[PDB]
Write an enzyme that holds these catalytic residues in place. Sequence first.
Site, PDB file in Angstrom:
ATOM      1  N   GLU A  72       0.814  -1.212   0.000  1.00  0.00           N
ATOM      2  CA  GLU A  72       0.000   0.000   0.000  1.00  0.00           C
ATOM      3  C   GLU A  72       0.864   1.287   0.000  1.00  0.00           C
ATOM      4  O   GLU A  72       0.996   1.943  -1.040  1.00  0.00           O
ATOM      5  CB  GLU A  72      -1.020  -0.033   1.162  1.00  0.00           C
ATOM      6  N   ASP A  73       1.486   1.588   1.138  1.00  0.00           N
ATOM      7  CA  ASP A  73       2.303   2.822   1.265  1.00  0.00           C
ATOM      8  C   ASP A  73       3.389   2.881   0.184  1.00  0.00           C
ATOM      9  O   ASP A  73       3.347   3.820  -0.630  1.00  0.00           O
ATOM     10  CB  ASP A  73       2.881   2.967   2.673  1.00  0.00           C
ATOM     11  N   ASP A 260     -20.699   4.350  42.147  1.00  0.00           N
ATOM     12  CA  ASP A 260     -21.448   4.233  43.405  1.00  0.00           C
ATOM     13  C   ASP A 260     -21.014   3.071  44.309  1.00  0.00           C
ATOM     14  O   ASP A 260     -21.571   2.912  45.405  1.00  0.00           O
ATOM     15  CB  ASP A 260     -22.941   4.098  43.098  1.00  0.00           C
TER      16      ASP A 260
END
Length: 342
Positions: A72-73, A260
């Site tokens: 990709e990159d 609580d």
Amino acid sequence: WNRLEPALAYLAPEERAKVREAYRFAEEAHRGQLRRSGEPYITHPVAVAEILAGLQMDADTVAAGLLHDTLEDCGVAPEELERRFGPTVRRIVEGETKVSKLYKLANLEGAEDLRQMFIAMAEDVRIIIVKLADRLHNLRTLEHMPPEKQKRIAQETLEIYAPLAHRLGMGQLKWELEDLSFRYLHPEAFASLSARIQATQEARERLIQKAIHLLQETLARDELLQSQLQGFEVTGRPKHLYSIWKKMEREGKTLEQIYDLLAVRVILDPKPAPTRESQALREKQVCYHVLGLVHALWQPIPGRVKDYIAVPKPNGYQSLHTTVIALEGLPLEVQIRTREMH
Ligand SMILES: [Cl-]
Ligand SMILES: [Mn+2]
């Protein structure tokens, strides 16, 4: 490399050699390239491999993490990755997430084709984890992005990746993905809730730590427990800010209403057992043994034992719960579970 190498200790020397060969290849493919931060690109696949190695991932998976952006990159190496790192690394780095089709198992009960089903599925799981490791790291380093692009990826993460993480049962990944996405999506809501917890949490923290130390030391000192145990972990409440803010809108509750009751978690990793059944027996024996130790240490509040080991939630949630009277005469909830359980 000197940062990554120690995390690879769990792999056989030959498996580690494949990872170094993968790193040195990524180092070449990503030579000269920079990220949004002036840092060299190689830092991203290394960080992704670190995330995978922390998860004790397969050698091909860690290696595929170093190479996930070599297609990709920068550059195209579909036949090169198969030639150099095998077909399984090439398969992971290529994207084949397919789709959730587990409902197909139920309808189709009816070998070499059922054998390949496992190897295809396990390969398909590994693809998803790398995508997840990658996304988690990007979100971590999102401070170098324009405030708009930041919101587009946080939404994509909440719509696509956090649910994919959930499917795979990776709650620890899903938690971080949700909370980092929340930070960048609604920052004003994030900073309001964060600083509000940093007010109650600091006051609680003194007691929680006293309790943590007391439980950790009580468990480590029990001889029989440590015999059937590999290790244990005593933490406070996890604080899932997105799932805490999500509940505030749904339930119409205040944040003061959630906290609580002071809570503590006991995660127990039992010693391994030869068979699947002698493991499930060991897995539970350990949990009630802790419940006893807990009740011997702090006074149990009548009818506050919630046994989800015996009666699991519809999502399969198993754990033992007990609200006790601990430090300063305060109601403390204890949750006893194994690593396997959630
Ligand atoms: Cl031990
Ligand atoms: Mn990436």
